[PDB]
Write a protein that binds this DNA or RNA. Sequence first.
RNA 1: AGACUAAUCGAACCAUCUAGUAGCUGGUUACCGCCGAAGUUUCCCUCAGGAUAGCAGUGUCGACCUUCAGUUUUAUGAGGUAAAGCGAAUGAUUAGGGACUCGGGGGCGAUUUUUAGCCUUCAUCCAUUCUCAAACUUUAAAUAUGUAAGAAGCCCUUGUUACUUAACUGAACGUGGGCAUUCGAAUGUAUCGACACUAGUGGGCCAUUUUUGGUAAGCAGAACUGGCGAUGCGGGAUGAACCGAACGCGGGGUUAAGGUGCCGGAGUGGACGCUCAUCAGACACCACAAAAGGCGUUAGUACAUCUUGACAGCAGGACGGUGGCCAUGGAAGUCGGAAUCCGCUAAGGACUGUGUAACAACUCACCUGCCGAAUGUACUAGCCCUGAAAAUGGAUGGCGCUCAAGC
RNA 2: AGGUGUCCUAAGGGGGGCUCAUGGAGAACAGAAAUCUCCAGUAGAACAAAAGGGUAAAAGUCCCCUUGAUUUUGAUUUUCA
RNA 3: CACAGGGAUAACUGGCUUGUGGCGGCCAAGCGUUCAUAGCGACGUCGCUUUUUGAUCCUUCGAUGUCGGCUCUUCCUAUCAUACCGAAGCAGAAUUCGGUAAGCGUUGGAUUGUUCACCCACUAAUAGGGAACGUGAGCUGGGUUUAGACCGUCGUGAGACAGGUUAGUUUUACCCUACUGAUGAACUCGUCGCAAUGGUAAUUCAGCUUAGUACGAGAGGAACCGCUGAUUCAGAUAAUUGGU
Lengths: 217, 158, 62, 173
Amino acid sequence: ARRPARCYRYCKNKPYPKSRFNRGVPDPKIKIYDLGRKRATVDDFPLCVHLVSNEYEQLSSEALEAARICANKYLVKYAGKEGFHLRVRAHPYHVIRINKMLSCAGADRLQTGMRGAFGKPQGTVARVDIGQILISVRTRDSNRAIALEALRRCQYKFPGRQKIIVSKNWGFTPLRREEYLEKKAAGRVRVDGAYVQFLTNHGNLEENMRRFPDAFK
Amino acid sequence: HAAGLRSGTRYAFSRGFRKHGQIPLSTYLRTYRVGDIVDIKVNGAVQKGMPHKFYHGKTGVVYNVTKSAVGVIVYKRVKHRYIEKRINVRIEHVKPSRSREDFLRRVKENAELKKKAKAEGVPVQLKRQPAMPREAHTVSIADNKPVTLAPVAYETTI
Amino acid sequence: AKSKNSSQHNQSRKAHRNGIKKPKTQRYPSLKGTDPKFRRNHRHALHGTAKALKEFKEGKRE
Amino acid sequence: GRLQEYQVIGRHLPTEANPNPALYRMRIFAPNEVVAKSRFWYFLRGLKKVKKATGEIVSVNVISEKHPLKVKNFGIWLRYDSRSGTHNMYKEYRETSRVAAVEAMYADMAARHRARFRSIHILKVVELEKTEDVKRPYIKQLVAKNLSFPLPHRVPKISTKKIFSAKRPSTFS
RNA sequence: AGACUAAUCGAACCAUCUAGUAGCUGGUUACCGCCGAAGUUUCCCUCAGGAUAGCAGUGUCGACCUUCAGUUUUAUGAGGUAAAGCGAAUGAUUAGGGACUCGGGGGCGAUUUUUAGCCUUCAUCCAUUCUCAAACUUUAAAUAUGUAAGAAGCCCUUGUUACUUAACUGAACGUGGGCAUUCGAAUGUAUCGACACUAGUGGGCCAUUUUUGGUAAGCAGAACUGGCGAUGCGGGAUGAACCGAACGCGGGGUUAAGGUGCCGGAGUGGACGCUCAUCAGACACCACAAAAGGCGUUAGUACAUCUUGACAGCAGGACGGUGGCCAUGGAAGUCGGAAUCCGCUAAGGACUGUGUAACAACUCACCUGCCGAAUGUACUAGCCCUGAAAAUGGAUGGCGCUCAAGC
RNA sequence: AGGUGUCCUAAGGGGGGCUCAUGGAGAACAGAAAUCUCCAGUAGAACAAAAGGGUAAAAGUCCCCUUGAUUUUGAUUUUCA
RNA sequence: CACAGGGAUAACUGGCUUGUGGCGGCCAAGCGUUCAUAGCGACGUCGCUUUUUGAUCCUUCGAUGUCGGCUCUUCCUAUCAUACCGAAGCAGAAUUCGGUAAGCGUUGGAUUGUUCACCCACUAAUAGGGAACGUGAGCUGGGUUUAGACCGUCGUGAGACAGGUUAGUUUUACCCUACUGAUGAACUCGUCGCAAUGGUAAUUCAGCUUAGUACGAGAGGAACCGCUGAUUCAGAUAAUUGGU
């Protein structure tokens, strides 16, 4: 089976997720989403790069794992097992059907032609838009060239056109690099597991002081 | 394909969010007379005297009054001709309409405003008119010096 | 064999061909559907008011 | 086309809460003042929350070249749309007036990059006062000292209705 | 053998009933003038057919009724689609942190273990984090949609009743009186209302936007509006549906879509650029081409070097401690294992190679002499090229076209 | 993606008192789970059946009395000529 | 077995599409003594063709003769052989990958109605396809597909079976065009000449010599010229031999 990917390239149907109405969908191909040292602190990896889409198309689940493996191997060999953190930010929830013309309607004739042509589940695909982020990588500042090459190598497994953008934020945080640096000096940032939390000065005064001892002097 | 009496009314007849429970009791204290202008709005809680889903949102004229219901006259548009329809609705669904209040307010003011001028002896120009184009005026730039603008260059956000 | 099922392509133009006619409103609507108890008494009320106004020539002069 | 520079001043409609609003002024290149106003509302809709229905035009004027008989160098900053993405450039021109450079730039971008008028924004035009601020190499050669050159192989002009000439022409004019 | 019974046999020949019936094929005879359609709703042993409503014509009467409207403005109601949401309910889903042991599993200090000991792997709870929903939602458009804009109006006084009220208190219908000096938004009114009788039609198709099944189709099925059918004329060389525009017989003037090197009526017209193809290219619907590449050429973004003088070329030098510590028939930079300092300078490394049993010699690195203004690396997108294979001889319409007659 | 050719003398009508599912902490045999007690608890329960809407001093639950599931005919709404 | 009709509706060609069938690319984990790219290529991804089979039902039901073989002409290139060349994990010999190229060739037999297939033998080689799945007023009639008859399974029965088996009529050209040849009016009748345009033709192998030489430890083992013959094709001729 596994028809060529050319036949399911355009978003032409309303979303068809698995629910209590359709049953028996095959298990998707991609399982792992985070690779590398996925528990480093925020201060360790201040550089981020993205792979941004540029078309309104469909990306198959099979292609997502192929690109994940290709980029992972290059980063490990040249940057080390502990020098990066890779995250895949596209999840396939759309189910594509197939009409088995010869398996279902062959040998024993039954009913053939276009009579009763509603299909059976065949795979899982992901929907993307223009400007949507696909893959993100964070690492040190001295590994900028390595990160760019790894992403450029993995776009040959995707159909369409994609771009590479170096983000201006700090890591995965939604803060500018300069803005985050000065806010941290004010004591309004506390450490967590691989992420951070921020002071909001809109609660009771008691535990706001222990959670943020350096905010109040 | 089926056609029941309440088919397709999943959201129309339902009460809103945080509005279930007791019906406000001022509804039953209103009074109606023949010739009044009322509009229909079906309440989900009351299951008696519910009009068909077509009339949910239409406006009509009262023509009959009874112990706990009123008769309303509404005009329905069948293909190529209009038909008069007469329905019976419980008072939990009807409501007085402010459609004609602007007219009734304006006629009262005009009569009194015309009376005072006739004693005084000046034309009124009572009837309304649409909006007219603006007139000439002058704008000073004292302590309001204009600021120059220009388009901004392209920049990447993410 | 098979054929077209249903359509509404030319119905709107056909209806507007010689106007969508609205029935004319008129001064005295009919009293069909009004409750009978109020209807019986209203009959007696009109009977009296005709006799009284007829007596206006040789009588009450209200 | 054939353009000329305007200044146009706009304002938000005054209201009871905010009397005396602010005043904004722009410089717009347009063939005529009917489309000069139209471009003003287009640029302003991308910077402030004002429309034409809720605004008004205060004044429109014409700016003319101060010295249209002097040769000078110009520099233009601009952005445009390609078939995929947006870009920024900076080009230079040599002529006598501000208006013609915009005319020359529009024809140049339409040929070399296939960019139409719909998708070009002009950021700033400045006249280069000195001679050491010329960057592009196709203009330094036009400002070299003691410039002079001949004109070889120039075809003579012959009336288009006079067919069947009687002798061979020459190209040494 | 379904064989033969006068060239006739799975039921002979002759006359009559008989002009047997047909929801099915074929045909249906002079001219001019005016108006001008439908393939859709409901029922039928109904689906190649009929009745019913619709569209159409003709004959009129009531007034010339001042009534109306596929329209806008102003006042006031209804809705759950596009978008949005998940540190908001139901459902789906990736990853760490804190708190906990008696929820389950495997250990440690004697697997002592009723040791809330020390470990920890799942599970649980709490504050955060990455993506979704035609049959999910706290919110919520645009376009379309109901009613009203007065003389049949507004206000005052007071007659009738078998209904209603403790009650002439209410309710409908009334008599009398008051309110135009202006009957109370815009525009139009080249078309107002009612009735009678009847023809054809009930196989449709195409296009913009929305949209369902299908890998897709000149494929099957829907919503609003415009068209062909029922229709010529000017452009697309040709072509029911595309663009302009709808038609009595003539004369003069001006244009639309499309065109001006010739066939072909009208520019080898003007201004600034790009392209050289031993497969150039040449106008919407439309008669096709992709991923990936080029030091062909043109324009652009960022970083780095340079008149204290680089890049290219030629020419000069290319040193000690020290054959370093180790290794050893022998290894002196150059089998191999492990470190990488200093003198002198502008520069020469306990060295990138060649080479000696081992030294040497030699190369590179680096600096200096000559010159005269630019140079290096990585990216973006314009035209062009490679990718590019079918059957009779052949088609930007043809000839032909190169600072074009191409873009 | 599903449903119907049924079921009910109460599972119809009237009235009154009460509040559900679940979770926390306790009590001989008693344990995950038997009965009793307190606090929290917006419906997360229930209402003959498919699904949707609706309901908290009730439309759920238990108790008391009953047969408006009765007689004579008209007007109106939905599918629609 | 019959009648009235239907291309509003199937079985064959043609038309749109290309899932399946066939063919060709891109990226580079790995295989390849070691070394991604001499020769290959996983996980993914972009295309072409209409000699496979499906989907559709637009044109023909007052008829376009429906399988295979024989005969004969022409065209396509995705090249089996031949000419000349570029690569290698190419010493010689033998092989593998690619370029310009369709000028010229591609066979004789056993079994089957076969298309398809499978063995023996020769050869430089026994490559793949189109033309209404070329070709029935050109042939043949073995198969399928009327009426006779037999068997097996099914049906109470008449009868059914893309199950096996045996016998079964193949019509017309003198018309128009096309093609192959042959005459021919007008400017007197003749003899001797030029050449616009159209057609075009050759093909492959073996023996001797080079040489038991180059190359290699050995085993093995080439080529250019030169000489003489042979295969397929074409145009003539009849002194000799054969046929009538």
